[PDB]
C-alpha cells in the first residue's frame, strides 16, 4: 500500500510537517514540507554514474510557483504558468548557494533539485519552506551530501530579532535577512536592511543560525527513520606521483615568478614555466593529456598565491590587504538621460543611468503573496565584452539576476518615500568592465546617477566586495577582491551601505571555523573600505542635482 512517514515539529510560531515515502517514489528522494498551510513539494534526482570526462559538478535547482497554490487562475494570455520569473530564479539561486559547497569534493554526478510550491498561506513565504525541503530531500536521498542545512528569515522590529516574520510583520521591520547553515557553520547570508549597524546585522546572523537548529535536528531524525542507504561513492584517488612531479618541476619557479612586480612580465614567465614544465615531464610520461597537466599547474599556482597572501606578502596586484584600487567618478556622462554616472574602481567599471516616469510606468507583479506594484526598478546588464570575451548578448544569464537584486537591495534603503517622491524610478546599470565585484560598482553608480537625476535620496550608498582566507587560526581579510582571487575566498562577502549603516549584506562561507569575532573584524574592514569609497563619491556629488 502507500504508507507516508510524517514528522511534525515546532519552528518558532509555526508547525512544520515533513512527509516522505508516498509521492514521487521513482526519484532519489521526495519530501512534502508544509509550514502553516504553505506547502512545497521538493524532489531530488541524482544520476548514479558520472559523465566520462566531467570536470564541474552539474547541480541544477529549479524553483516553481503554481498559481493554483493561491487559489487563482493565471492571468497570462495562455492562462498557464510559464518560464521562470525573476523571483523564481532568485529563490532557486538561494537554494543553490548553501547546498552546492556541501557536496563532497570530486563529486561530479548530475543532481537536480526541483521544488514546486503547491499551497501558499498569504502570510508564510514559500522560500524558507523550499529551502527546508531541499535540505531534507538531499539528506534522505543518500547522495553524498555533507549535512542537513537549516534556513531562517530574521527581521528587526522594535529593536528585537524576530524569527520568520510574516508578510504583515515585514512592513514595520528594519531587516529582511535569510541565513542558512549547518549545525557547525553559517554558509549563506542574503540580507537587506534600513541602514542598520554591523553588530545588529551579525547578531541577526547568529540569532537565525541558533534558531534553525530545530529544523536541522528534525531533518536528522527524519533521515534516521526514512533515509535511503548512503551512496557508495569514492573520489578518484590523486595521482600523487604526477602531482609531486609537476611540483618538483614548477613550484619553485612559480613561487619566484610571483615575486615579479610587472603584470605582463609575471604573466609571460608563468606560461614559460607552464609550457616548459609540461614538455620536460611529458617527454618521459609518454602521452599524458595536456589539460591534466594544466590543471595540476593551476592548482600549484593558486596554492602559491594562497601561501603568499597568508604569509603577509603583497597580493597579485601589489596591493596590501586593506588597499582599495584606484577610483574614478563621473556624473552627467550622457546628454539625454535624466541621470547618468560612470563609476570605475580599478578595472571594474559601470555605466549607470536613472530614468524618471509616472506612477503608471511602475511595474505590476502578480505574485503568490499577492498583487504588488513596484515603483523602483533595477536592471543590470553584464555584456560579454566586460571581460574581454565574445558571447551572446541580451541573455540575463551571467548571474545578472542575482547581481541586480544585490544592487537593488543596496540602494532601496536610501530611496525616498512615495509621499515625497511620487515618481517611478528605473536604474539601469551597464557593466563596461569587470575584474572584481560589478554588483557593488552598480550600487555606487546607482547612487551617483540618482543624485544626478535629482532624486532626493536619504544618503549616498556604496558597496565593497571583500574576502577572507583562513589556514588554521591564521586568517587575512582582503578588501576589493579581484576576479582572479576568487579562489582565495574562504568567506566571500559583499557589504553595501551608507556612511551610517549597512543596506545589504551577502556572505558565502565555504569553510568552517569562522566565529563571530572574525566576522566582526571582517565587517569592520569593510566599513573602512566603504567610508573611503563614500568620501571619494562625495567629493564628486554631495546633494541631488
Amino acid at each position: 500500500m502507500l504508507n507516508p512517514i510524517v514528522r511534525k515539529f515546532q519552528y518558532g510560531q509555526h508547525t512544520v510537517t515533513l512527509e516522505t515515502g508516498m509521492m514521487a517514489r521513482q526519484a532519489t528522494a521526495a519530501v512534502m514540507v508544509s509550514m502553516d498551510d504553505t506547502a512545497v513539494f521538493v524532489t531530488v534526482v541524482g544520476q548514479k554514474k558520472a559523465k566520462p570526462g566531467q570536470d564541474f559538478f552539474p547541480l541544477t535547482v529549479n524553483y516553481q510557483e503554481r498559481t493554483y497554490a493561491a487559489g487563482r487562475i493565471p492571468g497570462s494570455f495562455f492562462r498557464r504558468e510559464g518560464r521562470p520569473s525573476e523571483g523564481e530564479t532568485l529563490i532557486a539561486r538561494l537554494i543553490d548557494r548553501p547546498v552546492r559547497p556541501l557536496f563532497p569534493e570530486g563529486f561530479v554526478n548530475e543532481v537536480q533539485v526541483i521544488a514546486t510550491v503547491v499551497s501558499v498561506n498569504p502570510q508564510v513565504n514559500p522560500d524558507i519552506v523550499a529551502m527546508i525541503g531541499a535540505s531534507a530531500a538531499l539528506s534522505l536521498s543518500g547522495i553524498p551530501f555533507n549535512g542537513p542545512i537549516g534556513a531562517a528569515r530574521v527581521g528587526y522590529i522594535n529593536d528585537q530579532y524576530v524569527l520568520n516574520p510574516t508578510q504583515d510583520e515585514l512592513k514595520e521591520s528594519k531587516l529582511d535577512l535569510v541565513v542558512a547553515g549547518t549545525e557547525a557553520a553559517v554558509l549563506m547570508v542574503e540580507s537587506e536592511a534600513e541602514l542598520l549597524s554591523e553588530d545588529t546585522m551579525l547578531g541577526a546572523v547568529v540569532f537565525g543560525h541558533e534558531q534553525q537548529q530545530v529544523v536541522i535536528q528534525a531533518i536528522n531524525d527524519l533521515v534516521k527513520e526514512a533515509g535511503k542507504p548512503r551512496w557508495d561513492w569514492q573520489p578518484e584517488a590523486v595521482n600523487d606521483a604526477l602531482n609531486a612531479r609537476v611540483a618538483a618541476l614548477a613550484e619553485s619557479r612559480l613561487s619566484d615568478a610571483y615575486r615579479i612586480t610587472d603584470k605582463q612580465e609575471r604573466y609571460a614567465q608563468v606560461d614559460v614555466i607552464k609550457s616548459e614544465t609540461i614538455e620536460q615531464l611529458i617527454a618521459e610520461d609518454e602521452t599524458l593529456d595536456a589539460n591534466e597537466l594544466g590543471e595540476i599547474l593551476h592548482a600549484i599556482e593558486k596554492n602559491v598565491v594562497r601561501s603568499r597572501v597568508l604569509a603577509g606578502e603583497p597580493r597579485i596586484d601589489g596591493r596590501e590587504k586593506d588597499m582599495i584600487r584606484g577610483l574614478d567618478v563621473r556624473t552627467g556622462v550622457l546628454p539625454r538621460t535624466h541621470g547618468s554616472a560612470l563609476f570605475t574602481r580599478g578595472e571594474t567599471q559601470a555605466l549607470v543611468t536613472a530614468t524618471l516616469g509616472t506612477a503608471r510606468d511602475a511595474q505590476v507583479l502578480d505574485e503568490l503573496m499577492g498583487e504588488r506594484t513596484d515603483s523602483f526598478l533595477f536592471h543590470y546588464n553584464f555584456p560579454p565584452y566586460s571581460v574581454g570575451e565574445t558571447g551572446m548578448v541580451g541573455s540575463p544569464k551571467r548571474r545578472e539576476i542575482g547581481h541586480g537584486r544585490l544592487a537593488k537591495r543596496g540602494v532601496l534603503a536610501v530611496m525616498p518615500d512615495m509621499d515625497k517622491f511620487p515618481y517611478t524610478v528605473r536604474v539601469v546599470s551597464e557593466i563596461t568592465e569587470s575584474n572584481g565585484s560589478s554588483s557593488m560598482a552598480s550600487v555606487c553608480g546607482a547612487s551617483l546617477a540618482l543624485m544626478d537625476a535629482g532624486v532626493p535620496i536619504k544618503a549616498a550608498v556604496a558597496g565593497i566586495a571583500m574576502g577572507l582566507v583562513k589556514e588554521g587560526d591564521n586568517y587575512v581579510v582582503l578588501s576589493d577582491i579581484l576576479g582572479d582571487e576568487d579562489h582565495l575566498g574562504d568567506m566571500d562577502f559583499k557589504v553595501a551601505g551608507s556612511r551610517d549603516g549597512i543596506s545589504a549584506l551577502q556572505m558565502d562561507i565555504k569553510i568552517e571555523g569562522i566565529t563571530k569575532e572574525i566576522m566582526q573584524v571582517a565587517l569592520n574592514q569593510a566599513k573602512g573600505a566603504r567610508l573611503h569609497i563614500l568620501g571619494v563619491m562625495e567629493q564628486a556629488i554631495n546633494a541631488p542635482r
Binding site: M1, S34, I157, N158, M323, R325, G326, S479, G528
Partner: protein, 55 residues
C-alpha cells in the same frame, strides 16, 4: 562633475562594542486557521484496492 582618488589603503576604523538596545515589546501571536499539513497523510477521504482482476 568629476572626482578621482589613487590606490589608497583604507584601514579598518577603530571598533567600539555596541550596547544591545533593549525593548519590552511583545511580538503578538500568529493566529492560524487551517489544516496546516499537506501530502497524503492529510487526505479527508481515502480508498484503496490491491491488484485485482476486474470481475
Amino acid at each position: 562633475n568629476h572626482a578621482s582618488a589613487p590606490m589608497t589603503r583604507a584601514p579598518a576604523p577603530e571598533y567600539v562594542p555596541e550596547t544591545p538596545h533593549h525593548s519590552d515589546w511583545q511580538r503578538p501571536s500568529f493566529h492560524f486557521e487551517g489544516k496546516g499539513a499537506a501530502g497524503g497523510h492529510s487526505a479527508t477521504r481515502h480508498a484503496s484496492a490491491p491488484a485485482t482482476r476486474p470481475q
